[PDB]
Design an enzyme around this catalytic site. Sequence first.
Site, PDB file in Angstrom:
ATOM      1  N   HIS A 181     -17.731  -7.993 -24.071  1.00 12.52           N
ATOM      2  CA  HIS A 181     -17.012  -6.728 -23.851  1.00 12.52           C
ATOM      3  C   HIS A 181     -15.741  -6.618 -24.654  1.00 12.52           C
ATOM      4  O   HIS A 181     -15.239  -5.495 -24.855  1.00 12.52           O
ATOM      5  CB  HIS A 181     -16.823  -6.449 -22.382  1.00 12.52           C
ATOM      6  N   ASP A 210     -22.198 -11.586 -20.792  1.00 14.09           N
ATOM      7  CA  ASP A 210     -20.937 -11.239 -21.422  1.00 14.09           C
ATOM      8  C   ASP A 210     -20.401 -12.383 -22.270  1.00 14.09           C
ATOM      9  O   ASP A 210     -19.493 -13.119 -21.893  1.00 14.09           O
ATOM     10  CB  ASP A 210     -19.925 -10.846 -20.361  1.00 14.09           C
ATOM     11  N   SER A 244      -9.695 -11.344 -20.274  1.00 16.89           N
ATOM     12  CA  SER A 244     -11.106 -11.467 -20.588  1.00 16.89           C
ATOM     13  C   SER A 244     -11.351 -12.287 -21.844  1.00 16.89           C
ATOM     14  O   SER A 244     -10.619 -12.143 -22.815  1.00 16.89           O
ATOM     15  CB  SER A 244     -11.723 -10.080 -20.860  1.00 16.89           C
TER      16      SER A 244
END
Length: 303
Positions: A112, A159, A252
């Site tokens: 992402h 991810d 992230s």
Amino acid sequence: LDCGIPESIENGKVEDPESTLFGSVIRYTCEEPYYYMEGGGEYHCAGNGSWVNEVLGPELPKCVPVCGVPREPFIIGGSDADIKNFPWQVFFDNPWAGGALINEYWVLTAAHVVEGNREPTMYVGSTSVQKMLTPEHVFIHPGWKLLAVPEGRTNFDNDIALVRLKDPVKMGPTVSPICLPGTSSDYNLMDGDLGLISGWGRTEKRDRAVRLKAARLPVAPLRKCKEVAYVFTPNMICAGGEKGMDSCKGDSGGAFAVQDPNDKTKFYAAGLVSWGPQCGTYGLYTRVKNYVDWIMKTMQENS
Ligand SMILES: *[C@@H]1O[C@H](CO[C@@H]2O[C@@H](C)[C@@H](O)[C@@H](O)[C@@H]2O)[C@@H](O[C@@H]2O[C@H](CO)[C@@H](O)[C@H](O)[C@H]2NC(C)=O)[C@H](O)[C@H]1NC(C)=O
Ligand SMILES: O=S(=O)(O)CCNC(CO)(CO)CO
């Protein structure tokens, strides 16, 4: 009868030779403790004029980065961390996120983070976000669902992405790779296993952190994360639930660093910060062990 002054190697050196004539010996040493020799590094000056090693012949040794060992032992509810504590940490400035250096040419991050930025600018070696790495190509896992409207995503399965770099990263006290998980059952995480998270994401006091923060969190059953629609799969690790410590927006892609089971002095990337239902509760991390085959294949085929 003269082999000449020996050629140097990258990330290592040749000790000053006492002599360069027939029968002399020289030794190559890697730049420790950041690199190790891929021998014993000793070469003798042979009768054909070459410096020769028992294993490599006339070829020179290769110094490769040592992974997973910080120079100094060590995000919502975390504390100030120095980049020397997490030398594998990589910062992406657009979008604001992290990643983990896994070797001199590759960075692991969340899909992402790079889905909308296929030429990400990355930075390493500094505790504050206020060395720049240039990407060659971004490889997103094929199981990642690409979306027309990424905001509002509810399916974070798979991810994970790899970023191949244009130039090799120089390792040092502030920059070094983290290890990858092995495929044996010794890399199966259990409830309560402790890992470290690090990043410049939102904290309880600021929208983003200028200086690196870190926290130690335990792995938890997936149910905990579900009890805080969103997709939950076995490719995700749930961690947190204690003292309001959790990863948050902006963290992230950073690694959930766990002590290697076979070697207590090293850390490996067991997870990658992926997403979470509510900051300060439980968070979901991509389970790196499930992608080791793809990671190795991608690196091998793009070397
Ligand atoms: C010189 O020779 C080496 C091989 O070294 C000789 O053999 C060795 C056991 C020890 O006795 C030395 O003192 C001898 O000089 C060459 O080494 C080979 O190099 C090729 C490619 O160049 C390599 O395919 C072979 O593996 C290497 N062999 C092995 C033993 O190490 C070397 O190429 C020679 N140099 C020059 C200029 O001809
Ligand atoms: O080739 S790899 O991706 O490393 C193994 C398959 N991983 C999956 C991810 O959903 C199973 O964990 C299947 O692609």
